[PDB]
Design a protein around this ligand. Sequence first.
Ligand SMILES: Nc1ncnc2c1ncn2[C@@H]1O[C@H](COP(=O)(O)OP(=O)(O)O)[C@@H](O)[C@H]1O
Ligand SMILES: [Mg+2]
Lengths: 41, 681
Amino acid sequence: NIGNQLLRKMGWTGGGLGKSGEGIREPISVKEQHKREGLGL
Amino acid sequence: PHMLEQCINPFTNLPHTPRYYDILKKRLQLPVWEYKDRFTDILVRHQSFVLVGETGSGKTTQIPQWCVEYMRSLPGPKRGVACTQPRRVAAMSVAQRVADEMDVMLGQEVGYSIRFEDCSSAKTILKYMTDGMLLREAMNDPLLERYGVIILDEAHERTLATDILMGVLKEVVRQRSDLKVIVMSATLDAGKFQIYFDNCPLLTIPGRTHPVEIFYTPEPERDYLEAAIRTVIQIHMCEEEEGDLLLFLTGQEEIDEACKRIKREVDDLGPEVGDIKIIPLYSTLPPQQQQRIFEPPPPKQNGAIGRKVVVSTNIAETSLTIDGVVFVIDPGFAKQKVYNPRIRVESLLVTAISKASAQQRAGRAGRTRPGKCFRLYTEKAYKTEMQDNTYPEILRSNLGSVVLQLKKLGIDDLVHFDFMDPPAPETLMRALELLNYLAALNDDGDLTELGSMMAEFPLDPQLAKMVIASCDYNCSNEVLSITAMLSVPQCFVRPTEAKKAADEAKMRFAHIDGDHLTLLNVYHAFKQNHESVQWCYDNFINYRSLMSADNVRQQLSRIMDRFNLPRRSTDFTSRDYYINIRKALVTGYFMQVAHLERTGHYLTVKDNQVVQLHPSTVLDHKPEWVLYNEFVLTTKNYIRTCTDIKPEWLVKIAPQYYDMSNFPQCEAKRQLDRIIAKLQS
Ligand SMILES: Nc1ncnc2c1ncn2[C@@H]1O[C@H](COP(=O)(O)OP(=O)(O)O)[C@@H](O)[C@H]1O
Ligand SMILES: [Mg+2]
């Protein structure tokens, strides 16, 4: 939890980052493309 | 406010050249010129403002020149103008262009700055630089006092460095009232930039895009590169009207293969098929190759229309314009470097673009004349499979190097830093955790002396740490060479039709302990054969990659000299030569290690990714423990650039990470426990 300690040490409480706590809470997941299949196959 | 302007070059006090005036006639017709006075009226009354105009408006070439003219009107010692570009090729190409436009030599009054490529001098008063390079200048110049105007261009691409620069500049203008900041973007983005700079003024250039007909496939394509080549040749043969082609692909190797296949299928009709000039465009091209995108198409004897086909990455989506392009082919994909913080995996990904990107690509078909855009997908795929907008890079990236640069900049509170789009807490956690493991931050999260010096290297923190720590292993000379080779494109040329021959040439360099030392073998051999083009061909070595590695190594070694970091080698006759280098690799890449499991696959330590050695590896056997440079996330997981390491080096060099009180149960932990208990027996 060494990264969560350094974060709460910075002043992080919970929820999103940013100067108003407005940031997304969870990371976005990017869908990868396999081989050269066209979009929507 | 009004300075004497005789009709001489103000940098030479000699008449302008004939070409200067020819170019000047054309740029007075750019859409931005109409607005020059309205721009000036804003510039002299406001500290920051936003300028929005479609690609092709004249933003990047003309606005920085107007800022130079503004700077020349101010009293005191002369300062410069900086204009940041997300894209290397845009910065270098446009700096050459604007040097011409200003009637000066590139690198004198007009220059550029890319990582490892500084083309500037004491005379430089206008500098196009990547946004990353401006953030690096801020580390040793926190208020950026070398510049009187800073222009953040292509802001709509929302790169990591641009987003950080926006927050850094927002703080700088609080401390400096003389500095002008200008944000330029192709799109309004719901006034996001204006709001962010405290509701600053906005100047909007009307667009001049001609109509563009869009065509969709009837059904999904099974191969988008095959569809791309097919579409290109049909456009070349079936369109009556003159006009050039712009095909969007996703990277350098994919582009080259397309360029070869287009030239063959086209050259497969000797007569009466129009000449086509095939031009690649991707991020690492030398200036001589970059500039080919601008030279004119072939001529029309029996009326066969001549055309250019530019086969390009999304460099060509908004960052420059190739006059004459009328047809765009849009497979609908781009390449992104994605970071998954939950498993600590970064990887190059090919992904579907956003509707926003698709509209820009199609817009490039309409700059010169009415155009056409061939989207290689169905309209329902456009409507239900493509997101409205691209995610800002900050939301899908590894923040390790950005956190390190912010801490170096003295920005300690990264939770409340004014990100336009703040990243997820977990991602910021992994960045802090990484920098702590590397001893760049201490347990309080404060920058250490090692951290501060790592930040001076324009390298991933893992590489910077490795370079610095290798001095203590008396092998920094060789780890420098390896670092330079890892900082440039693939050095092994492997043609589709000559795989065996390329692979046999590669094995001439293979080190028994793996890929990192093979790169050392290639670089050493390159140097001892005097940088020969012929020797590169003889050995299927990429001449451009090796010349680029040599430049990188030279520039890195100046950083070493500046910090008095010794450049050392061990006796080549001793066993410790290759053992010291392999140990040094662990100092930076101890988190990228995989263990050979009983059934022959690999398992990455802690994160437990099932992977296999990448097929391009020189390893002819499976070491029980491998350190790897790159995670490759295709149909299978591969680890690429792999070196045999001993597990006792993990516990001795990076015991904070190889902490057996949290290490998950696995075969790797069983071996490490045995090692650790033996050390204590
Ligand atoms: N490198 C170049 N060589 C020749 N012409 C160029 C070059 N760069 C730009 N131009 C000309 O300038 C025009 C507008 O350029 P630019 O300042 O880059 O626009 P923007 O940044 O708004 O998209 C281009 O359409 C082309 O006519
Ligand atoms: Mg531009």
